[PDB]
DNA sequence: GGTAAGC
RNA sequence: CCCCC
DNA sequence: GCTTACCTGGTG
């Protein structure tokens, strides 16, 4: 067999607004998720 | 110039003494103590505090208040203050040097670890250069890890003498961030060495010891690399950006200093108080951090001292670091006043050297004129006009310093001017101004023009001047700079004026010609068919400004007087202009209206086009610049355009699709042509597909097939191309431009009307990007013209979708390269300039740099200016010895070989004259001696070389001047000629000196010119060919003398930059890729930009190393000889001949398990070991190619393993070629070990590193017995890999002729002289392969610079920039800050002899107009009254 | 005539530019250059949805 | 075969009468084009004389 | 002049500078097989006398520093057995002038 | 029209050929400084304001804004604002130094916070001139070189005159055949 | 290009469930020496198992998508030479209509 | 005979910019690349609002 | 992200 | 950025 | 023989 074509278009992905937004929303939610854990640790109630 | 009179004497900087501040000096030069982190607010009161951001160090508030000095903003340099550091701290810049100094001195007593008692040390202490000496002392002392009390005495090695006791063991110092950690010697004593500890032993280093290290007793003691008292820079260095009252943003430095301060107050508090000692170490290291991070905030040790914003804090070091840096961005280049920029537009009605300046710009830009009795009235009127009318003025500068603003001054209407006042008036018509087009790659990118104030918003320029600028009118912008002195404007007009730049010294040819409309129209105007009638003839004549007012007699008189185009264009050509040409079928009665003949500025025959009126070396332009001067020439551009342009405005010219539409039957021809080639392709396909296609030396059946295909399709594009181009009439507008030379070529006609042709990506036809197909529209395994990118249609017919895509694939190719190359091509340009900057021609004709080191003893080896050099033919060199003798030999003593009495009056009485024959015998003997010598210099016989003084033209002009009668005898004598030429040679002066060195140097410089001179003024030639008169011949000698002298270089020539730019500009145009040898591997070359880098970088690991081995004389024609030499050279391993190797369990040595090996046993037996058999089979073909036999191979294995292995083998004629091996706990696995080393590293035949050798049949030009140069081909071995050393001593080669692209390897084997010779060959070959031409002297100079140091000095930061040249100059390229620190620590002295140093200091450089001084002579000043 | 497909952030219209990347979960074989001791490499850049 | 193998690569080059040499003045010219300038201006055309062996350029 | 086959032992190589004013030169037999001075690219290098050198420096108004340099280990410097300081006159063919002479100071 | 430039019919230019509109919108906000310390949109006057711009404040209405329809030139004040840093400071906006035109639209609104927000659009007509860039759809870019009126222009017997004159030299090397076929 | 689009990202599970029903043997159950010929079935670069008659499965998949039952964006390729069947549910694939 | 698919229109291989060029199949490749980039420096009507 | 001259 | 040979 | 430390076109 011959070496893989590292430049074949079929092996390429174009990340649009959707996945790009999905990337932020995941880190942003997980940042709020751990911030909620700060409130729960500080909790005397 | 820094405002208001100073009584102090004004002087220039002659020397810069670099050093380091003693802490004592910082305190001595301080104005304020500095002690509060707080910057301002007197508690809250907005005004600066007694601590930071000064009392005292300067001012703010644009309120004078600068401490007693009390000078105010512009006038006040700031004043430094200090901060006393609570604990000493290392300076970042010197951390490494400190390590190295500690590594050289005993960490206890401060003594040097080595001394005079050590022989190696004595050798180092002898080193003159401090930098090299410290490097040596360190390399020695670093390993010394005890401070010896006693060492062996100079005489007795058994006895010892006390040196300087102590005897303490030294640590092994490692740098831990900003800390220095030692390891003395159970397990080692690890400890961090304190700053105080280091400082102390540095303070204890002997003067003699620190002077032996790079240091200076006065200017830079090593102890000063440790900081103790920090200088606080004044506000001008760290300005507080005020956002209007009670809002001010301090500089990053101001903030950093506050942190240093805060860290320091902290440490001082703990030190004084109850020091917890492990808290003290923290505040100490923090102080260290800030002090480090203030100067350099880009340390390897990651934490990057950030601003509370997340920004990283601008280190002082960061402000200086190049391009935008202080040096590069503010000193080498500046943003400047008296400048302008707009869109450039073209103008046929402007003289070559004028520049159309928009009024708005003219009214803005202002030249400052001094009120003199000559201008008093004129300037008075411009002042009255004010700043708003065109001939106007903006300001009036009084005796009393301050300037009057004419737009506001209540007195602006009044103002009675006085002598000496300056009037700042608007830029006006004829003011010399510097016009520029970026990127400024040449001297011609910037030229001086005369203003012409005009309406509309564009700078208008003459079309001819477009080419030097490399400008077009598709919205290009150009720059204008206004000179302000009567002195700088003379520099512009007398040195940089557009007409002075006509002939470029880069290419040694003119760099401006006739273009576009005028070039097209000039061909059209000058055909036989073109006649003009009175009406227009008059307007045409009236258009030439210089016209004599005389109506020329029409060519046709008869019942309709008609003038020919040629006839009237001749009016634009000045009188006394002679030019002869001869193109293809050209006779004196030119039938095609070919070539060119101009007699006394009147066209006799031929059409005028790119050849006559372009920027050709013998073109009407060149001849006019040379024969009449730049000003007459510049006038000529103007005149030719004014006439031709007018005629064209009236004739017209166009282009349409009609001009692309090639004939019906021609289209049939073109279609069957493409289909015919397509057939050949299919045939070569079916041949290849049926395994019948034959190999090709240019290997691979596949590579071979593609060659045939590619060629067939190229022959097709070009055959169809011609068919069309041939079928278009002489009326075809496209052809009419192609003919004039104005636009387009044959390719353009072929592609537009016949066939586009084959598309190429990476030098190969469109690849299978998909699996076995170029597009999904095709089948798999399709090698058809169509599938692999052949566009068969013309742009006129249109492209098919596939063709469209493949054309796009190959289109993109160029655009990628240009995008990639751009930075690499740029940085090469800079390095060349920075390396050659300081090279200039001195008043002794020598070529020297800033240090005054000789680079060339005479500029470009001849001492001539490249603008005065023209390719001339050295006749004597070629032809038969017989024809030479015919042409030159004069024998008065022989009836048949005397001079004919028809040739000279003396002819009848000269026959038999023995006394004159002795003279003609000298003449001929020298001419022969010359021919012999020329054939030594130029080995190939090449006759055409660029030399000063075009002798062809001088004789030609003498003949047209004196009306030479080629049918009358000459009044010349043989003595007149023989002795005449001899005396002329004595006056062709390049050098002057009344000593043998200079007189010999002079004789030498003129050697090649005199060869030409003697060859062109031989007695036989002068009389029988030129037919000169004494008067005529005298005029010739006279002119040669004058012209030669005009040709010598001018002391002051900035020859360095010139050469850098002459190699730089063509480099700019080379390609990264090229792939001209793609589709043929086992033939690889580095070329273009990559090879230019390999060269300039003196790259050690080059991509294509190669020996070119020439064969021993009488064996160069024998192919079989060369094959044997190939076998002797190419590195042949055992692996190279082996088919396979096997391991068997063959337990009986007497009887083999393998039935094949039966015969091998019966031999190596007929006349305790190992049962494990290593058996390897060899390839007969492999073995036979390298002239090898079983015995030779076996014996090599027998010697590589000695008595460890048992080797037996098959003899040379047995069907299978085999070698059987046996060894002498385990056994098995150590045989796999033996087979690995066996294959991988056993040399059979050949030289190592030479991995592949090929035979070539190079054609060679050599003289025949008959004398004529003849093509005598020879066999040549071309290698793959280098070992010049071994291949040279190989029998049967010509070791006098051997060569490598690896000049670095030539340098090593043959010496620096041969190294330089090879390097030139290499430099030349990169530029020239690209088609490009650079005059020798430029490349000569670069190669010389890279070579004068004894070895190869790269045009890199490591190479030239590490030389003995002045600090400031070297810091201007690459290692800016690092250079300056080293300059300080080693107390460097810059003599400001270099350009860069005078630029940084804003002083006139010793360059061109600065290469001498100007003095008033009171003696003559009196005599003139 | 407006096409949409953009965002309004603090008044300005923002385009999220399509970012080309190498696909994940794909097996790729590459020959490693002569200076390296490793002859060839089998690579997989694997990430889950 | 080994003597055939030992000989190095040749490379023919397709020639045109259209262009004429400078030095030898011969119409045995072998060109090639390349996009050296911006996409605004045209290609370059690098000509080689397959006769004398001389190289040149175009606009 | 010592012409050795393979190598001169470091023990023996120590004795080389031990007898001044006499100078010892070591050349490998293999190095001497071909005379590099005979090469196409190698021009005539001429050893200058102390007086000829004095004049060269005088005539061009030079510091020894300002002269182009030749390495001591240079194949041609070794061939002429050039000592440090010795200047060599180099006569090369020029495509510009006919002949051109350079000078190199052996350092 | 040599070396990538072109001749344009001045008559055509008069009759409206290639004329364009140019708009530029200037924005400003009343800044809030914690406790009531807020900027104001007003026509300031040298009577305690003391850091005013050089251009005319005279075009502004008492609300510190220009009425649309007004002509504006040079570095004239188009938006008037003060900063209460203490009495007043100038915060006014001059029309871009190198510009001129007519105030087209002025909008007084509110930012999400609740502060006065102002946007000011300025309109100008740009007419084809000598240095002006033009291009066809074939990478055939160029500037105007000169502009001739109808009489000086070449003419067909039909009385038709060109609007533009491009150079024959543009065509052969560029091989812009599509341009010719378009035409 | 004017008609290109980018795959949004579908769920692979209904295709995985469909495949195994259509004759795809689990990767645990595979015996290389008992069927080396067998076509390796790949979904989003995950080897799921093998198929004995890949020609039929390929047609049953293509017609199922053409009908609408498998999202038109899901890509399916059969490499006869390497004995592989690649299925992409994957988001970010540039595709065109034909 | 083996055809599986047919192209809808080959002119659909071009983008938005190169779609505006008249007869782009009658031009030298880089002319089309150059005009693609240029229409961005143009002006007409971007929206009716 | 490429080359070389440091340890 | 957005433009250039 | 590996790790570090330098660099990377021009205007606006
Ligand atoms: Mg341009
Ligand atoms: Zn002061
Ligand atoms: Zn000691
Ligand atoms: Zn030729």
């Amino acid at each position: 067999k011959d070496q893989d074509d590292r430049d074949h278009f079929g092996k390429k992905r174009l990340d649009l607004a959707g996945p790009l937004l999905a990337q932020l929303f995941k880190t942003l939610f997980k940042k709020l998720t751990k911030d909620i854990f700060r409130y729960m640790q500080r909790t005397v109630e | 110039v820094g405002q208001q009179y100073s009584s102090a004497p004004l002087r220039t900087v002659k020397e810069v003494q670099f050093g380091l501040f003693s802490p004592e000096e910082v305190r001595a030069i301080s104005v304020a103590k500095i002690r509060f982190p707080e910057t301002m607010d007197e508690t809250q009161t907005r005004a600066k505090i007694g601590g930071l951001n000064d009392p005292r160090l300067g001012s703010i508030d644009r309120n004078l208040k600068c401490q007693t000095c009390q000078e105010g903003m512009n006038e006040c340099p700031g004043h430094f203050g200090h901060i006393d550091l609570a604990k000493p701290v290392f300076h970042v810049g010197f951390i490494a040097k400190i390590k190295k100094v500690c590594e050289c001195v005993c960490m206890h007593c401060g003594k040097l670890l080595l001394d005079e008692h050590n022989e190696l040390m004595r050798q180092a202490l002898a080193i003159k250069d401090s930098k090299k000496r410290f490097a040596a002392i360190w390399t020695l002392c670093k390993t010394k890890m005890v401070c010896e009390t006693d060492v062996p005495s100079e005489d007795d090695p058994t006895q010892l003498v006390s040196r300087g006791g102590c005897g303490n063991t030294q640590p092994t110092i490692r740098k831990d961030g900003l800390k220095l950690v030692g390891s003395w010697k159970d397990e080692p004593e690890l400890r961090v060495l304190s700053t105080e500890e280091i400082l102390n032993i540095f303070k204890h280093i002997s003067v003699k010891d620190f002077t032996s290290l790079g240091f200076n007793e006065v200017f830079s003691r090593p102890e000063w690399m440790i900081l103790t008292c920090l200088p606080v820079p004044p506000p001008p260095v760290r300005p507080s950006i005020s956002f209007n009252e009670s809002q001010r943003g301090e500089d990053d430095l101001t903030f950093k200093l506050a942190d240093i301060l805060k860290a320091n107050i902290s440490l001082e508090t703990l030190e004084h108080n109850g020091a917890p000692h492990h808290a003290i170490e923290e505040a100490e290291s923090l102080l260290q951090f800030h002090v480090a991070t203030y100067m350099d905030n880009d340390i390897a040790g990651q934490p990057q001292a950030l601003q509370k914003s997340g920004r990283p804090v601008k280190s002082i070091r960061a402000r200086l670091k190049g391009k935008e840096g202080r040096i590069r961005g503010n000193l080498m280049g500046k943003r400047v006043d008296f400048s302008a920029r707009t869109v450039i537009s073209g103008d046929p009605n402007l003289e070559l050297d004028q520049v159309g300046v928009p009024k708005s710009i003219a009214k803005t830009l202002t030249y400052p004129e001094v009120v003199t009795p000559y201008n008093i009235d004129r300037l008075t009127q411009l002042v009255r006009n004010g700043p708003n009318e065109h001939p106007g003025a903006k300001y009036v500068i009084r005796d009393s310093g301050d300037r009057i603003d004419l737009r506001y001054s209540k007195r602006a209407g009044d103002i009675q001017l006085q002598y000496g006042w300056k009037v700042e008036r608007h830029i006006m018509d004829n003011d010399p101004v510097l016009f520029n087009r970026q990127p400024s790659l040449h001297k011609m990118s910037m030229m001086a023009h005369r203003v012409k104030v005009i309406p509309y918003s564009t700078f208008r320029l003459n079309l001819s001047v477009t080419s030097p600028y490399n400008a077009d009118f598709d919205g290009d912008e150009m720059n204008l700079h206004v000179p302000q002195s009567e002195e700088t404007r003379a520099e512009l007009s007398q040195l940089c004026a557009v007409p002075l730049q006509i002939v470029s010294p880069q290419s040694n040819k003119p760099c401006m010609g006739i273009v576009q409309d005028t070039l097209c129209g000039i061909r059209k105007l000058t055909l036989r068919d073109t006649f003009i009638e009175l009406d227009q003839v008059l307007n045409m004549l009236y258009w030439v400004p210089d016209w004599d007012g005389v109506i020329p007699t029409p060519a046709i008189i008869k019942p309709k007087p008609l003038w020919s185009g040629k006839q009237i264009l001749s009016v634009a050509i000045p009188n006394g202009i002679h030019l002869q040409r001869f193109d293809e079928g050209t006779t004196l009665l030119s039938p095609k209206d070919n070539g060119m003949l101009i007699i006394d500025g009147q066209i006799i025959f031929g059409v005028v086009e790119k050849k006559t009126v372009g920027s050709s070396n013998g073109g009407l332009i060149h001849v006019v610049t040379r024969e009449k001067g730049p000003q007459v020439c510049a006038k000529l551009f103007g005149n030719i355009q004014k006439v031709v342009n007018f005629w064209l405005l009236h004739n017209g010219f166009s282009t349409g699709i009609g001009d692309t539409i090639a004939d019906g039957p021609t289209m049939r021809e073109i279609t069957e042509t493409i289909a015919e080639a397509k057939k050949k392709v299919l045939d070569v396909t079916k041949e290849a597909q049926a395994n019948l296609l034959t190999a090709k030396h240019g290997m691979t059946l596949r590579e071979s097939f593609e060659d045939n295909v590619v060629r067939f399709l190229n022959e097709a594009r070009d055959k169809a191309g011609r068919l069309a181009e041939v079928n278009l009439k002489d009326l075809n507008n496209v052809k009419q431009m192609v003919m004039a030379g104005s636009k387009g070529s044959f390719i353009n006609i072929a592609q537009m009307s016949a066939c586009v042709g084959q598309q190429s990506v990476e030098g190969k036809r469109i690849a299978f990007g998909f699996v076995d197909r170029t597009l999904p529209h095709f089948s798999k395994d399709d090698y058809s013209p169509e599938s692999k990118g052949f566009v068969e249609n013309s742009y006129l017919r249109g492209l098919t979708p596939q063709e469209f895509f493949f054309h796009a694939m190959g289109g993109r190719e160029g655009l990628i390269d240009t995008a990639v190359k751009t930075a690499e091509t740029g940085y090469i340009q800079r390095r060349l300039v920075k390396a050659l900057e300081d090279i200039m021609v001195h008043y002794d004709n020598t070529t020297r740099n800033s240090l005054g080191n000789v680079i060339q003893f005479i500029y470009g080896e001849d001492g001539m200016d490249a603008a005065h050099i023209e390719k001339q033919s050295l006749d004597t060199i070629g032809g038969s010895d017989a024809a030479f003798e015919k042409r030159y030999r004069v024998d008065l003593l022989n009836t048949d070989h005397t001079l004919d009495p028809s040739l000279l009056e003396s002819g009848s009485e000269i026959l038999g004259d023995l006394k004159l024959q002795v003279l003609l015998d000298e003449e001929y003997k020298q001419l022969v001696k010359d021919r012999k010598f020329l054939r030594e210099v130029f080995v190939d016989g090449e006759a055409n070389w660029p030399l000063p003084v075009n002798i062809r033209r001088i004789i030609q002009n003498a003949q047209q001047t004196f009306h030479i009668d080629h049918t009358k005898p000459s009044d010349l004598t043989i003595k007149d000629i023989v002795l005449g030429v001899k005396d002329l040679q004595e006056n062709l002066l390049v050098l002057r000196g009344k000593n043998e060195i200079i007189q010999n140097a002079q004789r030498d410089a003129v050697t090649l010119f005199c060869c030409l001179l003697r060859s062109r003024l031989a007695t036989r030639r002068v009389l029988q060919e030129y037919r000169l008169t004494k008067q005529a011949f005298d005029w010739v000698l006279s002119n040669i003398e004058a012209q030669f002298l005009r040709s010598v270089v001018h002391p002051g020539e900035m020859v360095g930059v010139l050469a850098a730019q002459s190699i730089g500009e063509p480099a700019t145009q080379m390609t990264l890729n090229t792939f001209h040898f793609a589709g043929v591997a086992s033939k690889k070359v580095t070329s273009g930009v990559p090879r230019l880098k390999e060269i300039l970088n003196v790259a050690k690991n080059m991509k294509t190393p190669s020996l070119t081995v020439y064969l021993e004389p009488g064996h160069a024609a024998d192919q079989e000889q060369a094959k044997l030499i190939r076998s002797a050279i190419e590195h042949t391993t055992l692996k190279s001949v082996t088919i396979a190797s096997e391991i068997y369990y063959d337990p009986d040595p007497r009887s083999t398990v393998i039935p094949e090996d039966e015969e091998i046993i019966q031999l190596h037996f007929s006349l305790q070991q190992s049962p494990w058999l290593l058996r390897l089979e060899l390839d007969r073909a492999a073995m036979n190619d390298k002239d090898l036999t079983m015995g030779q191979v076996g014996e090599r294995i027998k010697q590589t393993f000695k008595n460890d292995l048992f080797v037996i083998w098959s003899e040379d004629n047995d069907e299978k070629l085999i070698i059987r091996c046996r060894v002498v706990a385990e056994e098995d696995h150590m045989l796999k070990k033996i087979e690995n080393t066996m294959l991988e590293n056993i040399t059979l035949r050949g030289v190592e590193n030479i991995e592949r050798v090929v035979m070539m049949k190079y054609d060679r030009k050599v003289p025949s017995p008959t004398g004529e140069y003849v093509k005598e081909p020879e066999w040549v071995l071309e290698t793959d890999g280098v070992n010049l050393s071994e291949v040279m001593t190989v029998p049967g080669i010509d070791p006098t002729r051997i060569y490598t692209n690896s000049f670095i390897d030539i340098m090593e084997v043959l010496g620096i002289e041969a190294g330089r010779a090879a390097l030139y060959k290499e430099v030349y070959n990169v530029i020239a392969s690209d088609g490009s031409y650079v005059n020798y002297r430029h490349m000569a100079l670069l190669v010389d610079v890279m070579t004068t140091q004894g070895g190869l000095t790269s045009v890199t930061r490591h190479g030239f920039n590490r030389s003995n040249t002045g600090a400031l100059m070297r810091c201007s390229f690459e290692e800016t800050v690092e250079i300056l620190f080293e300059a300080g620590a080693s107390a460097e002295l810059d003599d400001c002899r270099g350009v860069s140093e005078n630029v940084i200091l804003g002083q006139m450089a010793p360059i061109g107009t600065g290469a001498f001084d100007v003095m008033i002579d009171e003696e003559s000043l009196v005599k003139y009254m | 005539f407006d096409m949409g497909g953009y965002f309004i952030i603090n008044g300005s219209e923002k385009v999220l530019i399509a970012q080309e990347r190498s696909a994940g979960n794909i097996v790729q074989v590459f020959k490693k250059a002569a200076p390296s001791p490793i002859s060839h490499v089998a690579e997989i850049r694997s990430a889950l949805e | 075969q080994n003597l055939y193998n030992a000989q190095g690569a040749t490379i023919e080059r397709s020639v045109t009468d259209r262009f004429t040499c400078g030095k030898c003045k011969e119409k045995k010219v072998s060109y090639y084009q390349l996009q050296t300038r911006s996409a605004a201006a045209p290609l370059t055309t690098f000509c080689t004389c397959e006769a004398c062996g001389n190289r040149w350029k175009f606009s | 002049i010592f012409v050795y086959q393979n190598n001169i032992t470091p023990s023996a190589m120590k004795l080389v500078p031990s007898i001044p004013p006499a100078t010892i030169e070591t050349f490998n037999e293999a190095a001497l097989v071909v005379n590099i001075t005979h090469h196409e690219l190698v021009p005539k290098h001429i050893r200058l006398s102390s007086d000829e050198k004095r004049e060269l420096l005088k005539r061009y108004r030079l510091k020894e520093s300002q002269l182009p340099r030749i390495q001591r280990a240079d194949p041609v410097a070794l061939y002429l057995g050039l000592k440090r300081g010795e200047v060599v006159k180099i006569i090369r063919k020029s495509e510009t002038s006919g002949r051109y002479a350079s000078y190199r100071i052996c350092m | 029209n040599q070396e990538d430039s072109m001749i344009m019919n001045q008559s055509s230019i008069d009759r409206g050929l290639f004329r364009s509109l140019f708009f530029r919108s200037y924005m400003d906000q009343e800044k809030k400084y914690g406790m009531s310390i807020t900027e104001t949109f007003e026509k300031p006057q040298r009577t305690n304001t003391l850091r005013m711009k050089h251009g005319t404040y005279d075009k502004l209405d008492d609300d510190g804004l220009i009425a649309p329809g007004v002509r504006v030139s040079g570095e004239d004040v188009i938006i008037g604002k003060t900063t209460p840093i203490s009495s007043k400071r100038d915060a006014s906006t001059p029309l871009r130094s190198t510009e001129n035109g007519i105030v087209d639209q002025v909008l007084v609104t509110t930012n999400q916070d609740g502060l006065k927000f102002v946007k000011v659009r300025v309109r100008t007509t740009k007419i084809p001139q000598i240095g002006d860039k033009f291009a066809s759809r074939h990478g055939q870019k160029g500037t105007i070189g000169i502009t001739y009126r109808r009489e000086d222009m070449p003419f067909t017997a039909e009385g038709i005159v060109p609007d533009l004159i491009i150079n024959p030299h543009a065509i052969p090397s560029r091989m812009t055949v599509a341009h010719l076929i378009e035409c | 290009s004017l008609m290109s689009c980018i795959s949004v990202g579908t769920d692979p599970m209904p295709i995985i469930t469909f495949l195994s029903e259509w004759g795809m043997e689990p990767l645990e159950d595979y015996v290389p020496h008992q069927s080396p010929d067998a076509t390796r079935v790949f979904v989003n670069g995950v080897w799921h198992g093998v198929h004995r008659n890949p020609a039929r499965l390929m047609e049953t998949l293509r017609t199922l998508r053409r009908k609408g039952d498998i999202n038109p964006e899901v890509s399916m390729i059969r490499d006869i030479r390497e004995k592989e069947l690649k299925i992409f549910t994957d988001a970010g694939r540039v595709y065109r209509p034909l | 005979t083996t055809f599986t698919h047919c192209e809808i229109h080959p002119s659909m291989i071009l983008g938005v910019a190169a779609s505006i060029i008249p007869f782009p199949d009658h031009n030298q490749s880089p002319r089309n690349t150059y005009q693609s980039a240029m229409g961005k420096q143009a002006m007409g009507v971007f929206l009716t609002n």
Side-chain angles (χ1 to χ4, degrees), chain B residues 696-773:
Chain B
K696 252 179 212 180
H697 313 253
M699 71 304 304
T700 323
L701 247 63
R702 308 213 145 167
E703 283 184 336
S704 203
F705 161 85
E706 287 269 333
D707 182 73
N708 284 309
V709 172
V710 160
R711 186 178 73 255
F712 290 171
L713 298 177
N714 290 332
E715 290 173 349
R717 174 198 65 260
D718 297 294
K719 188 179 147 191
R722 192 208 289 111
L723 286 177
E725 112 82 46
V726 152
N727 160 266
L728 321 181
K729 320 98 181 296
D730 247 39
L731 59 109
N732 184 103
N733 298 272
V734 171
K735 262 180 106 200
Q736 277 189 81
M737 271 178 287
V738 178
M739 276 158 75
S742 81
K743 259 279 177 279
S745 55
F746 146 75
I747 315 119
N748 295 324
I749 291 157
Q751 279 184 94
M752 276 196 279
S753 64
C755 167
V756 166
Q758 184 62 59
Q759 250 43 58
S760 140
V761 164
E762 308 207 293
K764 316 158 86 177
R765 46 200 282 256
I766 313 290
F768 293 160
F770 282 107
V771 175
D772 295 35
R773 50 222 207 110

Side-chain angles (χ1 to χ4, degrees), chain D residues 21-26 49 51-54 56:
Chain D
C21 186
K23 207 264 169 186
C24 77
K25 296 187 94 186
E26 289 170 66
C49 185
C52 82
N54 175 35
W56 62 98

Side-chain angles (χ1 to χ4, degrees), chain B residues 300 323 328 335 438 822 826 1357 1374:
Chain B
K323 195 190 101 78
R328 278 242 263 148
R335 223 156 255 288
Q438 284 150 323
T822 223
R1357 20 174 273 260
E1374 325 275 278

